[PDB]
Ligand binder design. Structure first.
Ligand SMILES: CN(C)c1cccc2c(S(=O)(=O)NCCCCCCN[C@H]3C[C@@H](O)[C@@H](O)[C@H]3CO)cccc12
Ligand code: NA
Ligand code: NA
Ligand code: NA
Ligand code: NA
Length: 539
């Protein structure tokens, strides 16, 4: 019997174990209305073209329990069989009490019965279409259906085609910070639970007393976290798969107010509340639709924690997003799942690609082709060792920035110098450093000008003190000594291009001469290198 998938966390590192070894989700995620047998023919070709190893796809409460007590797993049966035929794995997305803050995917007998399953009430007494996490009947009903889905996987998915489940989808509330219903006010205007007071090491009191100006938001996050933890515990008691929640992000630099962003989700200001309230939820995953490097880089920093494995549970499917695979994996990320990878005639532009076509898919296939050939080796190095990864750090030049034209000719040479500097990244690899640059020839040392559009990146894993696994894309990687060498010289000892067969390295060729004189130059094609550096005495 195949071992259960498990999220391992050790010495601040994390692995998603699948079939007893670390695994990387090189994902594809459907649009929101592809969770039906007839839609699957519009999902698989994209997944094949992408080279994805894992499909993220919804399972909706409305579809599995359309009449109370009358369960229907017909979709899950077809999805399992067709995934198995393609030798891919699944992440099921439980669309239930919350889907983007709302109950649209709850059955009609739930979402149309507000007295049994109550909505968030604003301070002014107006109601929002967002179920209250203090609704005890709604918690019992969600938990009961979730348990029936997990019983379906316990009985029908013994080899764990499904490796992980997302509990709810982008929880929270737009339009208000919390529930201000009478039922919610009786809990708010009362003692904070001792367990939270103890975990945050705070002094006992009421929500307002203990949290002050943050009481309303922290209250909603705590109550939603508890609700999602209870659904999670109930499901894991049936089959103990990894389970996670996906966050409708607030802007980490300039968030605005809770309710403008989805209040109560796992936003960066309430990760402490979520971790204290929901010990059974494996990780809190960001849904990334910010296109600019600085903001995305900040999200990856905030969500990668000693207590939080990094899973990019959604990302935009426009071209600029593909290169974020590199920093995601460099952070020890367990996966990456671009959203909207199907041909069901929908695009979420402006969040994603304006057009969905083979070119849209190819931007992701090209970076997946760097990782797929080493996926198990990379996953093990990421968990047990030292890895790094970078993306091209300037976004594509805007029409408003092309401003460049109105610049004097000295402002221009200075711009070119400034861009070359910004397109040059340093990595400290112990005894050796790497310098990664973007958008230059494969010969000579003309400064980097960037790729058009921005697209490059690099992955490095340490194999030994002087040996690295390297693959990169539309970039140059150069090695150098990390520390002054006291009389010694240094060189590349050997660069081998090759592959892993049955976990053994197979060399195909040695890079040397022009291929190593000017750093290690990558285009759009996949090359996996083993780089051995040496210092040597000359005296
Ligand atoms: C600044 S910004 O990046 O432009 N802010 C955008 C963040 C708001 C986006 C909400 C995303 N929701 C996700 C969840 C998926 O299920 C599906 O709905 C999907 C959307 O296509
Ligand atoms: Na990892
Ligand atoms: Na060093
Ligand atoms: Na150094
Ligand atoms: Na090769």
């Amino acid at each position: 019997a195949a071992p259960l998938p498990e999220l391992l966390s050790n010495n601040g590192k994390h692995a998603l174990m699948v079939d007893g070894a670390p695994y990387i989700i090189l994902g594809s995620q459907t649009n929101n209305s592809s969770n039906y047998p007839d839609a699957l023919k519009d999902v698989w070709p994209s997944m094949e073209k992408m080279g994805a190893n894992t499909l993220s796809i919804p399972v909706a409460w409305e579809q599995i329990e359309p009449v109370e007590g009358q369960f229907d797993f017909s979709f899950v049966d077809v999805l399992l069989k067709e995934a198995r035929q393609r030798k891919v794995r699944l992440v099921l997305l439980w669309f239930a009490t919350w889907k983007n803050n709302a109950p649209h995917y709850a059955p009609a007998w739930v979402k149309l019965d507000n007295a049994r399953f109550p909505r968030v009430v604003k301070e002014d007494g107006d109601t929002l279409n967002s179920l209250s996490p203090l609704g005890q009947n709604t918690l019992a009903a969600d938990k009961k259906a979730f348990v029936e889905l997990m019983k379906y996987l316990a009985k029908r998915d013994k080899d764990h085609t499904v490796i992980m489940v997302q509990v709810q989808n982008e929880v929270g509330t737009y339009g208000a910070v919390r529930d201000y219903s009478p039922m919610a006010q009786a809990v708010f205007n009362a003692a904070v639970p001792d367990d939270l007071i103890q975990k945050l090491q705070l002094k006992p009191g009421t929500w307002s007393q203990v949290f002050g100006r943050d009481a309303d938001e922290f209250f909603h996050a705590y109550q939603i976290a508890r609700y999602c933890d209870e659904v999670t515990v109930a499901g894991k008691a049936i089959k103990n798969l990894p389970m996670y929640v996906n966050v409708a992000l607030r802007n980490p630099f300039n968030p605005g107010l809770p309710g403008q962003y989805s209040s109560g989700g796992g936003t960066d200001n309430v990760l402490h509340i979520w971790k204290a309230a929901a010990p059974n939820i494996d990780l809190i995953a960001p849904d990334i639709y910010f296109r600019d490097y600085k903001t995305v880089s900040k999200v990856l920093e905030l969500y990668t924690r000693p207590d939080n494995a990094l899973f990019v549970a959604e990302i935009g499917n426009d071209q600029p997003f593909a290169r974020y695979l590199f920093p995601t994996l460099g952070k020890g990320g367990i996966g990456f799942s671009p959203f909207g990878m199907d041909d069901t005639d929908y695009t979420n532009y402006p969040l994603g690609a304006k057009v969905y076509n083979d070119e849209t898919i190819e931007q992701f296939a090209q970076v997946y082709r760097l990782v797929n050939p080493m996926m198990r080796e990379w996953a093990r190095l990421s968990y047990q060792g030292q890895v790094w990864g970078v993306a091209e750090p300037l976004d594509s030049t805007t029409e408003t920035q092309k401003w460049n034209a109105e610049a004097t000719p000295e402002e221009k040479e200075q711009h070119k110098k400034d861009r070359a500097s910004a397109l040059t990244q340093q990595l400290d690899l112990g005894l050796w450093d790497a310098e990664v640059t973007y958008g230059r020839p494969m010969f000579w040392v003309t400064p980097p000008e960037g790729n058009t559009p921005a697209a490059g990146g690099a992955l490095i894993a340490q194999l030994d003190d002087n040996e690295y696994l390297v693959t990169a894309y539309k970039a140059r990687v150069e090695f150098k000594p990390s520390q002054e060498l006291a009389g010694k010289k240094f060189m590349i000892e050997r660069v081998e291009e090759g592959r892993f067969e049955k976990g053994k390295w197979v060399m195909e060729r040695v890079w040397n001469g022009d291929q190593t004189d000017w750093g290690l130059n990558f285009t759009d094609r996949p090359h996996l290198l083993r780089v051995k550096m040496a210092s040597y005495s000359v005296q």
